[PDB]
């Protein structure tokens, strides 16, 4: 139908638009400390303490996929990112402290990102 190819569209702009919100967001990460999965070989005890362990090479899976039907499903995702490494990584650690200095840096991003998505519909 012609109403399924419009709902089509607005997802690849969806799409276009969270793509531009990730490169930003990854951006606030010049260490790359969450661009790839957290390694089982290397933390084998992970899953036991994260269930649900997130990164940005898997969010752009998603996204490339266009698997996210919105923002708050895209703002999900992210918030794993941090919440997780808050969890298991103690306050002292350069791991703890990226991932707040993400935090705070992202809000900004994720803040005029929310504007544009209710703004262009």
């Known amino acids: 139908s012609m109403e399924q190819v419009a709902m089509e569209?607005?997802?690849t702009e969806l799409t276009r638009l969270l793509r531009s919100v990730?490169?930003?967001?990854?951006?606030?990460?010049?260490?790359?400390?969450?661009?790839?999965?957290?390694?089982?070989k290397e933390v084998p005890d992970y899953l036991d303490?994260?269930?649900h362990p997130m990164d940005f090479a898997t969010m752009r899976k998603r996204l490339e996929a266009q698997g996210y039907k919105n923002l708050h499903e895209f703002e999900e995702d992210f918030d794993l990112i941090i919440d997780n490494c808050?969890?298991?990584?103690?306050?002292?650690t350069?791991?703890?402290?990226?991932?707040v200095r993400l935090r705070d840096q992202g809000g900004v991003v994720l803040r005029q990102a929310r504007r544009e998505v209710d703004s262009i519909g």
Do not use: E, T, W
């Open 9 to 11: 569209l607005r997802l």
């Open 22 to 40: 990730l490169d930003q967001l990854q951006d606030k990460d010049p260490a790359r400390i969450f661009a790839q999965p957290v390694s089982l």
């Open 49 to 51: 303490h994260i269930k």
């Open 86 to 92: 808050m969890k298991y990584n103690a306050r002292d």
């Open 94 to 99: 350069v791991f703890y402290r990226a991932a």
